[PDB]
Nucleic acid binder design. Sequence first.
RNA 1: AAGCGCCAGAACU
RNA 2: GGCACCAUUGCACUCCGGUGCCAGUUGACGAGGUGGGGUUUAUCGAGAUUUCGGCGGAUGACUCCCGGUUGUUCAUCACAACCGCAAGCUUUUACUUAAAUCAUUAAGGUGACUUAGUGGACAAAGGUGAAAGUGUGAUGA
Length: 90
Amino acid sequence: RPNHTIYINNLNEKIKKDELKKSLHAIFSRFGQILDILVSRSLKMRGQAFVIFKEVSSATNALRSMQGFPFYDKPMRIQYAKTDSDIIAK
RNA sequence: AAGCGCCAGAACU
RNA sequence: GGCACCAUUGCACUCCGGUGCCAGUUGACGAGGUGGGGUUUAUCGAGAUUUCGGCGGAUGACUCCCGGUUGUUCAUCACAACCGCAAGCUUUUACUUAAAUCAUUAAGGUGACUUAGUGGACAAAGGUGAAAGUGUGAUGA
Ligand SMILES: O=P(O)(O)OC[C@H]1O[C@H](O)[C@H](O)[C@@H](O)[C@@H]1O
Ligand SMILES: [Mg+2]
Ligand SMILES: [Mg+2]
Ligand SMILES: [Mg+2]
Ligand SMILES: [Mg+2]
């Protein structure tokens, strides 16, 4: 179902952790207030992100508008997160 | 300101 | 930490697949010490993940040569042990700021770590002064 956090994958792996967190705060700021973007570069989490919006409504507009968007030469793939992130739980 | 300086191994990022 | 390649299309709150090539970082805490030449693996303790491993210095040690001191006062040659603006040996005696580690808390840095402050201590060698003992002979004098 719908969620506060959108799971983004198919992102370019060659890009550093910190500059990516700012590169997709540059785009997803349009849809609403972003709390924290979580990005790793490990074998598991290589080329995927978890952008956390304040409101769910913003995450839906983000999924609708940014689906298939070419970002670092690669079209983004956005799904809703399977579970709630441990910052919305509070 | 001379147990002082440097950094090729090693170790850690 | 960073580029190239290999492999990965995937739900997470102390980092975290692999090799290669770079890059960065750590890599001695104070005390002490220089007549000249040779020789050599260069003094003292503190700490305890590398203060390890490598290279460079270096005031060490010995050994000779040079120059001295002391050997009861001032002089020459021996000899003896010393010393390199100090100087025979023994017996005793104050001065001789340790600094890091430790603990802590700010600053910078992506991070490894770095700078600095604060708290409190704890050395050895050395050296510099008391004092009692004591150490030549010849030659002149
Ligand atoms: O300590 P090393 O890396 O062996 O270096 C050699 C010398 O280093 C320093 O100079 C020390 O004061 C000497 O005591 C030591 O002989
Ligand atoms: Mg030092
Ligand atoms: Mg010193
Ligand atoms: Mg060394
Ligand atoms: Mg050496």
